[PDB]
mmCIF file of C-alpha atoms (C1' of nucleotides) and ligand atoms in Angstrom:
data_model
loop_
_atom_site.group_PDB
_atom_site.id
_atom_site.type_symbol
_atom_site.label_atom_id
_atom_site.label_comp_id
_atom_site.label_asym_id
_atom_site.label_seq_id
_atom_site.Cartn_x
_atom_site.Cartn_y
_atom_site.Cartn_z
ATOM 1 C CA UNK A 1 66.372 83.128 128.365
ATOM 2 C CA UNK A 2 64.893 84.355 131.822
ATOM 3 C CA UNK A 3 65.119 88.164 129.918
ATOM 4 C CA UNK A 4 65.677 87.268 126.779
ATOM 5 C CA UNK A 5 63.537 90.143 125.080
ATOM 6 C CA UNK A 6 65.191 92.468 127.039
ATOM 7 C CA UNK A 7 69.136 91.272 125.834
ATOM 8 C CA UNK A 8 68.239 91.190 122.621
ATOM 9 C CA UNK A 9 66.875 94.370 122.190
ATOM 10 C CA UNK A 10 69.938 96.224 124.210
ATOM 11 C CA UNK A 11 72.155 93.678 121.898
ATOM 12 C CA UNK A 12 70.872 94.926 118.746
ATOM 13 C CA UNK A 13 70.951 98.514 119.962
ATOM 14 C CA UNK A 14 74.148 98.129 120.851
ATOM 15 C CA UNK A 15 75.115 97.177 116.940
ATOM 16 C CA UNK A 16 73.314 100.019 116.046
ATOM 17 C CA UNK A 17 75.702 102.193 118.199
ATOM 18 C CA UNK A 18 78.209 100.283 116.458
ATOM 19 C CA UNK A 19 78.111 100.336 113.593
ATOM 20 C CA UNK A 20 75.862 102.747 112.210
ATOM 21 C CA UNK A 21 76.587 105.672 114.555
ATOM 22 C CA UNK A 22 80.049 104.838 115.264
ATOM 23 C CA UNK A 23 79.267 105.912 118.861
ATOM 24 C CA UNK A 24 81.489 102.724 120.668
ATOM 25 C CA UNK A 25 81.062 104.157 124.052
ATOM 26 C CA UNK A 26 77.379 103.729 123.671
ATOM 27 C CA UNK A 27 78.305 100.254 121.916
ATOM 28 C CA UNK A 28 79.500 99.123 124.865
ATOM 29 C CA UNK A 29 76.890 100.778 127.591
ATOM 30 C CA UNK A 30 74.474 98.423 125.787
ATOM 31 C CA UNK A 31 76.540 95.639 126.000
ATOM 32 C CA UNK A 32 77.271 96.080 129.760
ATOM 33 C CA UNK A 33 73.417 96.298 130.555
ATOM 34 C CA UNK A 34 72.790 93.358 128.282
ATOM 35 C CA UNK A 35 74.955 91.633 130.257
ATOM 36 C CA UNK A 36 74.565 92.990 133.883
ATOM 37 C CA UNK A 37 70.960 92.228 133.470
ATOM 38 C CA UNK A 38 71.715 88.152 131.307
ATOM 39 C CA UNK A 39 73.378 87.747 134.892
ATOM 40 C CA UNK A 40 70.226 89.163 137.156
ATOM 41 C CA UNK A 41 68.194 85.827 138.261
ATOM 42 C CA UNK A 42 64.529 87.288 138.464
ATOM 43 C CA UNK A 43 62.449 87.867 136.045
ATOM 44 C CA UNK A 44 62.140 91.865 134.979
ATOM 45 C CA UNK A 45 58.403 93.354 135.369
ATOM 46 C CA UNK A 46 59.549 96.851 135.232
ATOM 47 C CA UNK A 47 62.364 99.738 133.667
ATOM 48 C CA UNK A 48 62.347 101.000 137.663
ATOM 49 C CA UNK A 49 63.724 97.025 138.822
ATOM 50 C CA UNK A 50 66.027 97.001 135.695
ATOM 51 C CA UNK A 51 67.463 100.707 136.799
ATOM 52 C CA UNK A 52 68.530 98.953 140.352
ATOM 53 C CA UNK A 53 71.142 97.201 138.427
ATOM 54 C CA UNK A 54 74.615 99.033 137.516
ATOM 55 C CA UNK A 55 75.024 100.198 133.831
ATOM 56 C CA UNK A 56 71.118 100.145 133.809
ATOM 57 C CA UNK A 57 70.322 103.827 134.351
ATOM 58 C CA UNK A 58 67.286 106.435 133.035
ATOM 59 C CA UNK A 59 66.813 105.948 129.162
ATOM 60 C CA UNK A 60 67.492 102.189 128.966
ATOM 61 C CA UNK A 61 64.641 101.389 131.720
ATOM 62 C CA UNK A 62 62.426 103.422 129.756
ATOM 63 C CA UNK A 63 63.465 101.660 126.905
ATOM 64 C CA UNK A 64 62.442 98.781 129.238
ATOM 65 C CA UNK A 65 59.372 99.918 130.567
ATOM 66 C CA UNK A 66 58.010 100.131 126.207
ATOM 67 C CA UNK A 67 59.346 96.936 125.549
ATOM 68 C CA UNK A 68 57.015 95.354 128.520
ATOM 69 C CA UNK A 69 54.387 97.272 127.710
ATOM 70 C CA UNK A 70 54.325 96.763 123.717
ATOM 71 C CA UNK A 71 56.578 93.954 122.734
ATOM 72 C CA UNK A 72 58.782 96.297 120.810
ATOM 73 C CA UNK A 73 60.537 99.329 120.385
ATOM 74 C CA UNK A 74 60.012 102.031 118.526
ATOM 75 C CA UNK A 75 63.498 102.853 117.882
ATOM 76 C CA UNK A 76 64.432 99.690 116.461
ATOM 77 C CA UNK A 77 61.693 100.043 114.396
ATOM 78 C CA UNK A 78 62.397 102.933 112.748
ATOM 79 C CA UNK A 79 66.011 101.856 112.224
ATOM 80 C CA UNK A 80 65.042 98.536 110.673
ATOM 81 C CA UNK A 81 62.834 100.414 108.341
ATOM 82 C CA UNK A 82 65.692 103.302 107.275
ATOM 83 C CA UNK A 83 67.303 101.864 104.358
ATOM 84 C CA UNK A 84 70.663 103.241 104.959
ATOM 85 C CA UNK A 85 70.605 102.094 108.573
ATOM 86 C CA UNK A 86 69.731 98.841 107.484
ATOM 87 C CA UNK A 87 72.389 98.498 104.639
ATOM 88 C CA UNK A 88 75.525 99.572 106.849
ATOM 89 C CA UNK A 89 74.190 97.437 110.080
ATOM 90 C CA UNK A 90 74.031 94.833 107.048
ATOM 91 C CA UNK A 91 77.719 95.499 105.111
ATOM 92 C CA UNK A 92 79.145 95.537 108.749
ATOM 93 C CA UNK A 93 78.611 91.493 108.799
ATOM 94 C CA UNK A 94 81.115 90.929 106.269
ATOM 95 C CA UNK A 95 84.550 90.598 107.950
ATOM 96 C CA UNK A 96 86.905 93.674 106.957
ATOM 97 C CA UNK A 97 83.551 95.640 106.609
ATOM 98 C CA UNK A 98 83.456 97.992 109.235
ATOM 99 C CA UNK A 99 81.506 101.309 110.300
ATOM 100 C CA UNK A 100 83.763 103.287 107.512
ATOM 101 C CA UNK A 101 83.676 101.136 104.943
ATOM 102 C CA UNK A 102 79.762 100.172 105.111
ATOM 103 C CA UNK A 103 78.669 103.382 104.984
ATOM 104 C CA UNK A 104 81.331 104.637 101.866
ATOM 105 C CA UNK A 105 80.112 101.298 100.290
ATOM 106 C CA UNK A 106 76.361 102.575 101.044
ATOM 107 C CA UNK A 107 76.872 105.929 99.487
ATOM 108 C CA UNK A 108 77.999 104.281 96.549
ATOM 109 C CA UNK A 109 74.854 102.388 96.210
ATOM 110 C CA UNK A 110 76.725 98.790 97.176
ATOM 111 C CA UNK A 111 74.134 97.890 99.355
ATOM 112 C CA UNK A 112 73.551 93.736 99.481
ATOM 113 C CA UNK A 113 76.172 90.400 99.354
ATOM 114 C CA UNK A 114 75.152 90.551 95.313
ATOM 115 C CA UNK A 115 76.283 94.165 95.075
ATOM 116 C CA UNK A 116 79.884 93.566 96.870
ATOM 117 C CA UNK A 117 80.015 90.457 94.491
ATOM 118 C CA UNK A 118 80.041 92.631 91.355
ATOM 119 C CA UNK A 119 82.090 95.313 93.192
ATOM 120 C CA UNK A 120 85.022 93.190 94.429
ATOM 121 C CA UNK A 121 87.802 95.069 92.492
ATOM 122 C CA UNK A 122 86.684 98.064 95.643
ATOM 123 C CA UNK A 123 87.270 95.286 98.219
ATOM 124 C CA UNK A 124 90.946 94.678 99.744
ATOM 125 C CA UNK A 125 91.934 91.285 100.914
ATOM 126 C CA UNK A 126 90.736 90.744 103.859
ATOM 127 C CA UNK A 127 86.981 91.717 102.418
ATOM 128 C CA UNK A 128 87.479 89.599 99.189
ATOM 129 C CA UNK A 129 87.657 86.565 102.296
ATOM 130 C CA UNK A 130 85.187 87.885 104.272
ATOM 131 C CA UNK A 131 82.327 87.874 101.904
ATOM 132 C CA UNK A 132 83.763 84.310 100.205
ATOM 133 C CA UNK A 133 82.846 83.057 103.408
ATOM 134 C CA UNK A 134 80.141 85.458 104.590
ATOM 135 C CA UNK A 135 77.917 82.359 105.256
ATOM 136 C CA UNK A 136 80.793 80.225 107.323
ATOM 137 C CA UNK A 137 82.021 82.734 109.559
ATOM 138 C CA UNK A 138 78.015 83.699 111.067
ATOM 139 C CA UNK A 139 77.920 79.657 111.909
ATOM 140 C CA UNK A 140 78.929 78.548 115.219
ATOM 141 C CA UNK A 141 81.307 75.716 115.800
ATOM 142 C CA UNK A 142 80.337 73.068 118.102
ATOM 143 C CA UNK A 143 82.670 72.204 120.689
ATOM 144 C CA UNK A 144 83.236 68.672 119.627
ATOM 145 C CA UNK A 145 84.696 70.320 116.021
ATOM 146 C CA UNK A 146 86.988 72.709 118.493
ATOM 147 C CA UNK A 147 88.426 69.464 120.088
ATOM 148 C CA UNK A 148 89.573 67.739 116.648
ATOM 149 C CA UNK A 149 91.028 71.746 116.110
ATOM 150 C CA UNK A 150 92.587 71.746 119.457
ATOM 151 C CA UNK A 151 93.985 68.501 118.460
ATOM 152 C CA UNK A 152 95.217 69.200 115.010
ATOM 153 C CA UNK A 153 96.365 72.449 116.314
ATOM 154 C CA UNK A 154 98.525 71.037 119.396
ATOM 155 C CA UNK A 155 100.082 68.047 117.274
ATOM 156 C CA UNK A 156 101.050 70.191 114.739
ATOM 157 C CA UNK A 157 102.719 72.423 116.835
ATOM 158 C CA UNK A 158 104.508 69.868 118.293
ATOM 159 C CA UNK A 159 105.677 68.945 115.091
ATOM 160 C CA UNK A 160 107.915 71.860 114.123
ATOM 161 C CA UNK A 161 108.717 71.967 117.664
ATOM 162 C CA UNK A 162 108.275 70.184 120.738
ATOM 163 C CA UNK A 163 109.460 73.492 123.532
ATOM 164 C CA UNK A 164 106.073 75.162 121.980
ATOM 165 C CA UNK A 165 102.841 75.339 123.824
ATOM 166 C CA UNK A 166 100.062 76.444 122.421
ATOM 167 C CA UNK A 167 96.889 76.777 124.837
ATOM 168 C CA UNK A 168 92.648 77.380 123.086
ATOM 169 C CA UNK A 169 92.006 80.243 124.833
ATOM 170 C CA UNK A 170 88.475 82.603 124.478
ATOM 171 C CA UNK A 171 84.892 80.548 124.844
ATOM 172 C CA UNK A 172 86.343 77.328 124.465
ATOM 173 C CA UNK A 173 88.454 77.829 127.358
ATOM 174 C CA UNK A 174 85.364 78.784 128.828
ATOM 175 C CA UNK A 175 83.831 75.488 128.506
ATOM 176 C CA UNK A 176 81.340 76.789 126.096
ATOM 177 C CA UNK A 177 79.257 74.051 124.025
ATOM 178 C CA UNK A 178 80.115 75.991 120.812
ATOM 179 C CA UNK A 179 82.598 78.900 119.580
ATOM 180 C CA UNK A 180 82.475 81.704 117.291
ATOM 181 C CA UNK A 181 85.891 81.146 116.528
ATOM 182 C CA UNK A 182 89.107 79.308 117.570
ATOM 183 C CA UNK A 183 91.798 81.315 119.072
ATOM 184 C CA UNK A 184 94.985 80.037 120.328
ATOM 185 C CA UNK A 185 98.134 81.383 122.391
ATOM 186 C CA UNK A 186 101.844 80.505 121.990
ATOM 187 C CA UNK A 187 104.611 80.356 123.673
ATOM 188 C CA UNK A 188 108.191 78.722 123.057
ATOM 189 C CA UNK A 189 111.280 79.290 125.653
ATOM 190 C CA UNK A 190 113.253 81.471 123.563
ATOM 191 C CA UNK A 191 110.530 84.201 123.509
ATOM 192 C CA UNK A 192 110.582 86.099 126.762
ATOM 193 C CA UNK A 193 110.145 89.744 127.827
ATOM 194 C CA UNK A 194 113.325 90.203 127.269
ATOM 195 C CA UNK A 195 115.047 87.911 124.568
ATOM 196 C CA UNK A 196 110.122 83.730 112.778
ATOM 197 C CA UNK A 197 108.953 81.862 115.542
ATOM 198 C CA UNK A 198 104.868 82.106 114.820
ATOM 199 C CA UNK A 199 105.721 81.948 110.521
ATOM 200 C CA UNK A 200 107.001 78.341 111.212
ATOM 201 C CA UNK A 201 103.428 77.385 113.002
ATOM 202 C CA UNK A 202 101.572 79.050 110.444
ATOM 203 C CA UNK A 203 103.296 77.681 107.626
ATOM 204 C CA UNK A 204 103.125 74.125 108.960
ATOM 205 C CA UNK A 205 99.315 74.866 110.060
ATOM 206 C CA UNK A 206 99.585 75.708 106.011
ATOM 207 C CA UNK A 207 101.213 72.604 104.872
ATOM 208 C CA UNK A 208 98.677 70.244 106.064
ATOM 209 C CA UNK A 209 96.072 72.393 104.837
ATOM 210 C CA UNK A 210 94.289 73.013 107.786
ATOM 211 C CA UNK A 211 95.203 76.869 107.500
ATOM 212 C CA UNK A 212 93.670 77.970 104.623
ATOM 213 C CA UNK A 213 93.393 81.875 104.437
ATOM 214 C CA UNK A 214 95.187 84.723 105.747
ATOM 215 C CA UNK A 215 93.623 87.720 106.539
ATOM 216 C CA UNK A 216 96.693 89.404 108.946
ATOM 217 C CA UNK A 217 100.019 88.305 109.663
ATOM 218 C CA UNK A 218 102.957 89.584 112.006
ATOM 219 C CA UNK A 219 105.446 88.364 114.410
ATOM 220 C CA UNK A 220 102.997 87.838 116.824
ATOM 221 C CA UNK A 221 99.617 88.034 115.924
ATOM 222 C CA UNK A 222 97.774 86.068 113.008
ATOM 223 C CA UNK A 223 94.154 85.890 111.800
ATOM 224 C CA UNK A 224 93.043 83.867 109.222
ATOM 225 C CA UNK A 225 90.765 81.144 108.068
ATOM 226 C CA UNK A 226 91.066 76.896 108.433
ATOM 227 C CA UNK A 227 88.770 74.169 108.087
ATOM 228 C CA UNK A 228 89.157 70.403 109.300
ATOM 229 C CA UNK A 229 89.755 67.873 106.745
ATOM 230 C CA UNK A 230 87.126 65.942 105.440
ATOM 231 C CA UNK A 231 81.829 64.541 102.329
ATOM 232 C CA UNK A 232 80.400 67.607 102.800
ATOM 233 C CA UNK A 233 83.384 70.018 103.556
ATOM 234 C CA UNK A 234 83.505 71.317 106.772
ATOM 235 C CA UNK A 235 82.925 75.103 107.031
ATOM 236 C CA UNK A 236 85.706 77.206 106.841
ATOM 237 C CA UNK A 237 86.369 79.073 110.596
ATOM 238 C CA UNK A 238 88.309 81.854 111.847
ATOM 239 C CA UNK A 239 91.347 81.413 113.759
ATOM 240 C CA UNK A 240 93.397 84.052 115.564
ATOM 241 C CA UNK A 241 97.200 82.709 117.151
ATOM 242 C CA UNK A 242 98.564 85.349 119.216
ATOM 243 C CA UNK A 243 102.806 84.189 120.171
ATOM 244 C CA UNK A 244 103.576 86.106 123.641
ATOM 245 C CA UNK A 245 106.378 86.199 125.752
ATOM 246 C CA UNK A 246 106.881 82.762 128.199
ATOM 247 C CA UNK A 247 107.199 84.700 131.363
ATOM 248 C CA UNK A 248 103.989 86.394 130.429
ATOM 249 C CA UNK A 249 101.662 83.529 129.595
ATOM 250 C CA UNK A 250 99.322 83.907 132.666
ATOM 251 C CA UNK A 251 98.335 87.518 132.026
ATOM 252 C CA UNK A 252 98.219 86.598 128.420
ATOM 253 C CA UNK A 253 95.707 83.707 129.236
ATOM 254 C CA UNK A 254 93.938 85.706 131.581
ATOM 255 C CA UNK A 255 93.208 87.855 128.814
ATOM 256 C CA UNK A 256 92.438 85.706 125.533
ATOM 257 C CA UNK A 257 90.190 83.535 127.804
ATOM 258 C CA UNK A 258 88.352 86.453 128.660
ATOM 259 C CA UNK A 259 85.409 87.264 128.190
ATOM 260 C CA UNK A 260 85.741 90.699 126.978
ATOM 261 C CA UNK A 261 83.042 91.956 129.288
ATOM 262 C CA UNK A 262 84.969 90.469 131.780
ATOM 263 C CA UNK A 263 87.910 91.567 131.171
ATOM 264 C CA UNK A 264 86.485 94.803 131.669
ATOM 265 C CA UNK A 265 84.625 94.264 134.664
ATOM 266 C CA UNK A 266 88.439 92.703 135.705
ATOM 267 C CA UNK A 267 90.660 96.116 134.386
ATOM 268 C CA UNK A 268 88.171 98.530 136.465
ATOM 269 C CA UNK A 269 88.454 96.604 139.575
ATOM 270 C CA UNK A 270 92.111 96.343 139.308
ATOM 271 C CA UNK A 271 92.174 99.832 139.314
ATOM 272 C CA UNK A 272 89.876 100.458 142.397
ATOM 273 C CA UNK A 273 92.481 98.099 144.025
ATOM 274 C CA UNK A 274 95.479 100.196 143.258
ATOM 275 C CA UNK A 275 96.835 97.583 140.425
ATOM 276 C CA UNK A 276 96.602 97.963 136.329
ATOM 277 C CA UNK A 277 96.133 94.940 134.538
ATOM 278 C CA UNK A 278 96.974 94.272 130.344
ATOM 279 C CA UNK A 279 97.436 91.561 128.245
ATOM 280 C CA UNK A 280 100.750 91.270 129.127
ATOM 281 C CA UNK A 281 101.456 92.461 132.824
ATOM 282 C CA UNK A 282 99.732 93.128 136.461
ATOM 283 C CA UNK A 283 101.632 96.312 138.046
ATOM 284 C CA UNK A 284 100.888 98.443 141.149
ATOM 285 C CA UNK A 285 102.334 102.100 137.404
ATOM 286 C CA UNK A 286 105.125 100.280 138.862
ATOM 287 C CA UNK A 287 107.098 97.479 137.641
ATOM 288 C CA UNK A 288 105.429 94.169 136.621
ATOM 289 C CA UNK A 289 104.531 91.990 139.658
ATOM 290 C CA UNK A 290 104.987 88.055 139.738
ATOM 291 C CA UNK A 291 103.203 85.506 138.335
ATOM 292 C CA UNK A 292 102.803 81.627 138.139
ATOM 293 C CA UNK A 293 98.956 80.992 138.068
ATOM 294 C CA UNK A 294 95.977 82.611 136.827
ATOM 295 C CA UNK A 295 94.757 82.868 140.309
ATOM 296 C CA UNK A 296 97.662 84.853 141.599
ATOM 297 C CA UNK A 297 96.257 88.051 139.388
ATOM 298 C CA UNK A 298 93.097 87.100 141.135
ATOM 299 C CA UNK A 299 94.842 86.841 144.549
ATOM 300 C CA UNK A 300 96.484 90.604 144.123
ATOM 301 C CA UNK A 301 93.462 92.053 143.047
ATOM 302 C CA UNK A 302 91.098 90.036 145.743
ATOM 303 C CA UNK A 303 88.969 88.592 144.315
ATOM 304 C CA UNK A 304 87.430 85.099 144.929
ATOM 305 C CA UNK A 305 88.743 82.673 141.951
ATOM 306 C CA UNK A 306 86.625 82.259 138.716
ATOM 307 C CA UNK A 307 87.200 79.236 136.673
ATOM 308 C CA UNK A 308 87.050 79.703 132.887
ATOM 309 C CA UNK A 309 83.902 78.709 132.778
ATOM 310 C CA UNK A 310 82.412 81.439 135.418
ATOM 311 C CA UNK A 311 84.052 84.388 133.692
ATOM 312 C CA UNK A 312 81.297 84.419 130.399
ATOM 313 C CA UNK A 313 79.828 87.710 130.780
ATOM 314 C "C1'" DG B 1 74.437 105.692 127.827
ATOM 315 C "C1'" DT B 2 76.014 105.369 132.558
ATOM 316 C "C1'" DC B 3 78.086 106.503 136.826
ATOM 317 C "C1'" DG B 4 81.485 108.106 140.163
ATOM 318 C "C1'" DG B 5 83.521 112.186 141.485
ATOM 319 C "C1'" DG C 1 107.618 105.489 95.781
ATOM 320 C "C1'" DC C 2 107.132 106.824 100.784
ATOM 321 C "C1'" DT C 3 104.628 107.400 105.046
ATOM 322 C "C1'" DG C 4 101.378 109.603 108.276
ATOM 323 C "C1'" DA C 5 96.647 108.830 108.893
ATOM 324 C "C1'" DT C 6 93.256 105.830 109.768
ATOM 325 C "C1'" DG C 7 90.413 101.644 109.438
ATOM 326 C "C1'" DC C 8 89.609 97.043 111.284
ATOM 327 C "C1'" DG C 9 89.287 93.444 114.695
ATOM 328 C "C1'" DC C 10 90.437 92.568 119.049
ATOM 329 C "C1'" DC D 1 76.862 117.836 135.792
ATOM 330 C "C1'" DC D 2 81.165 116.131 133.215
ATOM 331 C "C1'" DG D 3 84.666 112.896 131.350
ATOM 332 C "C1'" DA D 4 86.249 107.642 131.305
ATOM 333 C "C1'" DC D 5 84.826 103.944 129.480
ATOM 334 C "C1'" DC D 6 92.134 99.922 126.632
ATOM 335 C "C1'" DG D 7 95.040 100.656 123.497
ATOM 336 C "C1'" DC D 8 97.553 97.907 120.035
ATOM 337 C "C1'" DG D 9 99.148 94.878 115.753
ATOM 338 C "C1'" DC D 10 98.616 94.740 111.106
ATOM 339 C "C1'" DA D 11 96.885 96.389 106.297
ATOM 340 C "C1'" DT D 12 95.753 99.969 103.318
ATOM 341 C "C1'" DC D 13 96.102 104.330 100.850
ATOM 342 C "C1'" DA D 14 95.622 109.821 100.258
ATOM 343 C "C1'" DG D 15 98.668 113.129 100.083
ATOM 344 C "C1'" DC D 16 102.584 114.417 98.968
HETATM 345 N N1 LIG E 401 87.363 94.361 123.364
HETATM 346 C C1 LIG E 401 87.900 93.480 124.218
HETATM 347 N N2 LIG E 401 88.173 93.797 125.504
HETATM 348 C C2 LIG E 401 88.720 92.911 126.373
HETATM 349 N N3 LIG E 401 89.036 91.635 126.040
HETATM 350 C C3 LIG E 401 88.762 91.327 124.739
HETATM 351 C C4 LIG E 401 88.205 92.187 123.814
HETATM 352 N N4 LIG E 401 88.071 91.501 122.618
HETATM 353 C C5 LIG E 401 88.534 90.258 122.846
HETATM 354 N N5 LIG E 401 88.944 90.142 124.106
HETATM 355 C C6 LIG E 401 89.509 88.995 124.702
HETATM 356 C C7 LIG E 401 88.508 88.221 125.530
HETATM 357 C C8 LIG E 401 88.035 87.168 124.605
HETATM 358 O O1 LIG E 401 87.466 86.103 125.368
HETATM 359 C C9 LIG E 401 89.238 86.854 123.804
HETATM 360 C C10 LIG E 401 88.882 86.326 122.500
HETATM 361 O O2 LIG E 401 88.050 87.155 121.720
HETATM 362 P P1 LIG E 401 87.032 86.646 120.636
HETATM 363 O O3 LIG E 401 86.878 87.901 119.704
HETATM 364 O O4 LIG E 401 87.609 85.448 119.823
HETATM 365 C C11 LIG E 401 85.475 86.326 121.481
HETATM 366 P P2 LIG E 401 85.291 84.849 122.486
HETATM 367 O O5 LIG E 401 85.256 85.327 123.927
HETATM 368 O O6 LIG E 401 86.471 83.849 122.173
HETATM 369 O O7 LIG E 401 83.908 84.170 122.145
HETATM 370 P P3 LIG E 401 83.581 83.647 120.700
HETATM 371 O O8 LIG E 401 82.515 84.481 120.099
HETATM 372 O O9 LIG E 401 84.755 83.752 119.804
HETATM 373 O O10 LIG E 401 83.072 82.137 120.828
HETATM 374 O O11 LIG E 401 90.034 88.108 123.767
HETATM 375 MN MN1 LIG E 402 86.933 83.396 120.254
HETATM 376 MN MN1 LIG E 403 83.208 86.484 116.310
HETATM 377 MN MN1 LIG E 404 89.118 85.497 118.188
HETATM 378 MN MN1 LIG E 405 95.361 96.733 124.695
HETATM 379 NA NA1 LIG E 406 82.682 93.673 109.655
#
DNA sequence: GTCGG
DNA sequence: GCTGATGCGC
DNA sequence: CCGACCGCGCATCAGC
């Protein structure tokens, strides 16, 4: 809130980049000034004190220095106004909508939520779900909905088998007061590096209804859609389950706890440390070093030890 | 769009 | 009918 | 001043 104005504008820039220009490199300069300066404790006066800051450089503090001086920019402006700009930055909100799809749709002259209504026959799957619950998957989910998930989730599990663990990872793990989404990580002991296992979760999650859409599914990734059990009916939320091998959990939930900007921020220092760090593995690239805490990749790469709840960037 | 090389 | 190409979310 | 800034799992479909 201390530069609110600021992170908002760069934010919605940043979708611009996104999704209109399809320029992701740009996407994700915005993001890392939105966030370099979210993290900066004083109050900006000027584009010259924001340009101090790294990923702040010459056209985002004059960007700055107009949105001090008038309230607004320009740019966003005119990009609000452009029709086409408008419609694809809109489109893009539906999930399966992306840059490529938005702006086909556009050209078409499918433009609005009615417009993809009467056009569904030119949506696949994953859009036919997306815009049935375009309104549900914008709302947030308060944490205290996460922990009857977590709990429905984790018993569940436990129920087709009791070896699996399954660990909330991303802002909940974080300790944030509400979600976008819930996404968990499994692991069971006969899944290692080396060695149907996530279709017998789902399909349970399934049989108590608390899965109720799905959107992708593989052997070790699925996204889809569930809802608690109720009343008004709870809104229906996304969920992502990601199955990895046991003897790479740590690196794994390391990752999915993220957040993305820190994971980043993370991957970059690794490298200026002589180490390379995935999803999966921390390596010198060499072979994958030992782990058996989160703080061990922290301890390799030296850095002081962030709990979950530090690493929201 | 930014920054290290 | 197949599959390389690519989109999407991450 | 010029390139790196992750790269992958899963779904779809244009071009044979
Ligand atoms: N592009 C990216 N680069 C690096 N890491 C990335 C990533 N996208 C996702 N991640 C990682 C970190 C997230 O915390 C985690 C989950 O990604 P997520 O898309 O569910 C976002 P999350 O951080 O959970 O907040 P929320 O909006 O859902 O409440 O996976
Ligand atoms: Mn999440
Ligand atoms: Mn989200
Ligand atoms: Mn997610
Ligand atoms: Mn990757
Ligand atoms: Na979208």
């Amino acid at each position: 809130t201390l530069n609110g104005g600021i992170t908002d504008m760069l934010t919605e820039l940043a979708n611009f980049e996104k999704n209109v220009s399809q320029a992701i490199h740009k996407y994700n300069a915005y993001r890392k000034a939105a966030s370099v300066i979210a993290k900066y404790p004083h109050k900006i006066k000027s584009g010259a004190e924001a340009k101090k800051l790294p990923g702040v450089g010459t056209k985002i503090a004059e960007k700055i220095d107009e949105f001090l001086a008038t309230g607004k920019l320009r740019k966003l402006e005119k990009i609000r106004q452009d029709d086409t700009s408008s419609s694809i930055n809109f489109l893009t909100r539906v999930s399966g909508i992306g840059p490529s799809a938005a702006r086909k749709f556009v050209d078409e002259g499918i433009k609005t939520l009615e417009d993809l209504r009467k056009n569904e026959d030119k949506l696949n799957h994953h859009q036919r779900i997306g815009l049935k619950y375009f309104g549900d998957f914008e709302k947030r989910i308060p944490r205290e909905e996460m922990l009857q998930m977590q709990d429905i989730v984790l018993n569940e599990v436990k129920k087709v088998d009791s070896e699996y663990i399954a660990t909330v990872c991303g802002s909940f793990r974080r300790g944030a007061e509400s979600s976008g989404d819930m996404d968990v990580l499994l692991t069971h002991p006969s899944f290692t590096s080396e060695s149907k296992l996530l279709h017998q979760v789902v399909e349970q999650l399934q049989k108590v209804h608390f899965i109720t859409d799905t959107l992708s599914k593989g052997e070790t990734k699925f996204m889809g859609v569930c809802q608690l059990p109720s009343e008004k009916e709870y809104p229906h939320r996304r969920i992502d389950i990601r199955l990895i091998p046991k003897d790479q959990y740590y690196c794994g939930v390391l990752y999915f706890t993220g957040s993305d900007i820190f994971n980043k921020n993370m991957r970059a220092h690794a490298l200026e440390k002589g180490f390379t760090i995935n999803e999966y593995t921390i390596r010198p690239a060499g072979e994958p070093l030992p782990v058996d805490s989160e703080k061990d990749i922290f301890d390799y790469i030296q850095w002081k030890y962030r709990e979950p709840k530090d690493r929201s960037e």
